[PDB]
Amino acid sequence: LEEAPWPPPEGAFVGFVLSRKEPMWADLLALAAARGGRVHRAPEPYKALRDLKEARGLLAKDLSVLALREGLGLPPGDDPMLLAYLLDPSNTTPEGVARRYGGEWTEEAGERAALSERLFANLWGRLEGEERLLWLYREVERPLSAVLAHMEATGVRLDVAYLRALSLEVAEEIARLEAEVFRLAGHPFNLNSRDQLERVLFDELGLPAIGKTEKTGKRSTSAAVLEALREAHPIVEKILQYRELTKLKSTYIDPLPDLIHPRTGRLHTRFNQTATATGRLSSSDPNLQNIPVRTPLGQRIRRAFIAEEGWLLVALDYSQIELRVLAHLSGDENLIRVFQEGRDIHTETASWMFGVPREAVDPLMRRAAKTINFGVLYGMSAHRLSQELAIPYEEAQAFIERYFQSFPKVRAWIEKTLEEGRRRGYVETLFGRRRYVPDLEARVKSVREAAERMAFNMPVQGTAADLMKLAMVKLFPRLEEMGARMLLQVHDELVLEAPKERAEAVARLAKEVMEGVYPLAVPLEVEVGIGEDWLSAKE
DNA sequence: GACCACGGCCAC
DNA sequence: AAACGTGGCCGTGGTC
Ligand SMILES: Nc1nc2c(ncn2[C@H]2C[C@H](O)[C@@H](COP(=O)(O)NP(=O)(O)OP(=O)(O)O)O2)c(=O)[nH]1
Numbered sequence: 001l002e003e004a005p006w007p008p009p010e011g012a013f014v015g016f017v018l019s020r021k022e023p024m025w026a027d028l029l030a031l032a033a034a035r036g037g038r039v040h041r042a043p044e045p046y047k048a049l050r051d052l053k054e055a056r057g058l059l060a061k062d063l064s065v066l067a068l069r070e071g072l073g074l075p076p077g078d079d080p081m082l083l084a085y086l087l088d089p090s091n092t093t094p095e096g097v098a099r100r101y102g103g104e105w106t107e108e109a110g111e112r113a114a115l116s117e118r119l120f121a122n123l124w125g126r127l128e129g130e131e132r133l134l135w136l137y138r139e140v141e142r143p144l145s146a147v148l149a150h151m152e153a154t155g156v157r158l159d160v161a162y163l164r165a166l167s168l169e170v171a172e173e174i175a176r177l178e179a180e181v182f183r184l185a186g187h188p189f190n191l192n193s194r195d196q197l198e199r200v201l202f203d204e205l206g207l208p209a210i211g212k213t214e215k216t217g218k219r220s221t222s223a224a225v226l227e228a229l230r231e232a233h234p235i236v237e238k239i240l241q242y243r244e245l246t247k248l249k250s251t252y253i254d255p256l257p258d259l260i261h262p263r264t265g266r267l268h269t270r271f272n273q274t275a276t277a278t279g280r281l282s283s284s285d286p287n288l289q290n291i292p293v294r295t296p297l298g299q300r301i302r303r304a305f306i307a308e309e310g311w312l313l314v315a316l317d318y319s320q321i322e323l324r325v326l327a328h329l330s331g332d333e334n335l336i337r338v339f340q341e342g343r344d345i346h347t348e349t350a351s352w353m354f355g356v357p358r359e360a361v362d363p364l365m366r367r368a369a370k371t372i373n374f375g376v377l378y379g380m381s382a383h384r385l386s387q388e389l390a391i392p393y394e395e396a397q398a399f400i401e402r403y404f405q406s407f408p409k410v411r412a413w414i415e416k417t418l419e420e421g422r423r424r425g426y427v428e429t430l431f432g433r434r435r436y437v438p439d440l441e442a443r444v445k446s447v448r449e450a451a452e453r454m455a456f457n458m459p460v461q462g463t464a465a466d467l468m469k470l471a472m473v474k475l476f477p478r479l480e481e482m483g484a485r486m487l488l489q490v491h492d493e494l495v496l497e498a499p500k501e502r503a504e505a506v507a508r509l510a511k512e513v514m515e516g517v518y519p520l521a522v523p524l525e526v527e528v529g530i531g532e533d534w535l536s537a538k539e
Numbered sequence: 540g541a542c543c544a545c546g547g548c549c550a551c
Numbered sequence: 552a553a554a555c556g557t558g559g560c561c562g563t564g565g566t567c
């Protein structure tokens with residue numbers, strides 16, 4: 001391109017280089033812009049930011065986040081990554097999108113800006129006529145990128161002193177468990193090395209190996225295997241306890257306090273918008289979509305996510321979301337009636353499984369029931385279901401028979417979906433988001449049936465992700481007007497932060513927006529709570 | 540120091 | 552482990 005002096009004209013495509021992938025932590029090393037066969041390279045990138053009216057180009061959200069960090073309202077606009085991702089969600093990285101649609105991802109801002117210009121022109125051309133993907137682009141993904149930029153720049157408050165103290169309490173229990181393990185094994189070794197554990201459990205001790213690992217064929221030490229040996233030998237029980245605590249300490253308790261940002265005082269994740277095959281978001285650096293919740297220690301970790309002084313967290317989570325979606329997608333009159341009758345299939349499976357009244361279904365029982373309901377739904381084998389439910393193969397098999405018999409329109413939908421996937425090569429959501437599933441016609445059964453399970457899961461999970469994204473796009477302006485903040489999305493949940501005097505109003509409003517986002521054949525229902533911390537707000 | 544594969548496991 | 556699906560991060564073990 002012909003080098004032109006900064007600033008660029010309105011509507012130019014930007015390119016930028018970060019010192020590191022995380023925008024909230026990155027030094028802006030270079031800034032450039034391309035338009036009309038000219039490239040503009042900034043002499044000092046931080047100052048040059050002030051000249052742009054929007055971030056338009058590859059990874060626009062990231063630059064917008066860094067501008068917000070610097071106090072600049074630079075919203076993300078067009079991003080060829082989002083076009084590629086809607087065309088095919090295996091388009092996940094600039095490296096790949098460039099290597100597919102006519103360019104090369106380098107480490108120079110001017111080139112990245114020129115690349116952004118050429119990739120947009122191309123991908124926008126490929127989407128000419130794809131009016132459903134163009135709707136999703138204009139009405140969901142492009143506006144959503146602005147929402148995520150704000151969430152990423154806002155962050156969440158963390159009770160650091162609390163987690164530091166918890167680290168010590170957990171450490172003392174870890175050393176106790178290790179001591180009991182070393183004693184049972186008769187000698188010390190590295191519990192964290194599954195190779196060494198394998199030799200202790202299955203060679204030194206006489207324990208039987210239930211299963212083997214995929215790539216290398218070692219005898220597995222997975223929880224599922226160890227659960228199979230739970231009473232086979234006590235050491236197993238302590239191993240499982242040691243695993244839980246080191247997992248939570250090494251992944252959450254210890255890393256998270258060290259990630260608080262100097263200027264904000266808060267913790268900042270990244271919401272990756274072109275990372276999943278189904279249309280879901282993902283979260284990284286750190287992942288705040290897999291913060292513990294299930295166990296008593298996990299609940300203690302979640303209590304560390306707290307509201308700024310004078311504010312409250314509002315947590316909203318859709319009810320039985322993919323089951324309602326399935327009702328709408330399949331048109332099963334029976335499943336639809338379940339939700340018009342306001343029943344709850346998780347608590348009912350729970351009461352089935354645990355032989356207890358729906359009044360006696362604690363959160364652990366529901367989460368166990370969730371896994372059964374979605375496991376069975378998405379093709380789980382009777383054999384595993386017997387293992388999980390600790391119940392004979394004949395029973396587990398009739399569980400699956402009952403499940404499907406209750407909702408016959410479902411299996412008709414599954415086979416319609418798969419037939420469509422074979423014919424067109426892709427499956428699609430309610431709003432037309434696509435996943436290409438080429439292995440539906442594979443000649444190896446195992447490969448083909450795996451593709452089948454991925455293929456007919458995507459319309460259900462991807463529709464739910466579509467609804468949530470749309471809700472976020474609708475809800476966000478309403479929150480800014482009430483002086484509230486959107487902090488986190490966890491697939492079918494949102495965490496907000498609101499002034500204490502507005503929290504009831506924000507909660508009421510957010511629940512209405514989310515439930516009425518896009519009426520289906522069944523009502524969407526949202527559970528909402530309010531609390532000083534993430535855990536209190538979900539109750 | 541940078542990467543990577545693997546097994547393993549947290550969440551939805 | 553396994554004919555549930557979708558992610559990202561851990562420590563180990565390893566290379567360059
Ligand atoms: N295939 C599969 N999908 C799952 C699993 N866990 C979650 N999902 C998918 C399917 C779920 O619909 C969705 C949201 O997960 P939740 O909010 O934790 N559960 P839900 O909204 O259903 O019930 P309620 O909110 O009343 O507790 O994530 C799983 O083990 N397997």
Ligand SMILES: [Mn+2]
Nearest residue numbers: 317318319492
């Ligand atoms: Mn839910």
Ligand SMILES: [Mn+2]
Nearest residue numbers: 317318492493
């Ligand atoms: Mn949820």
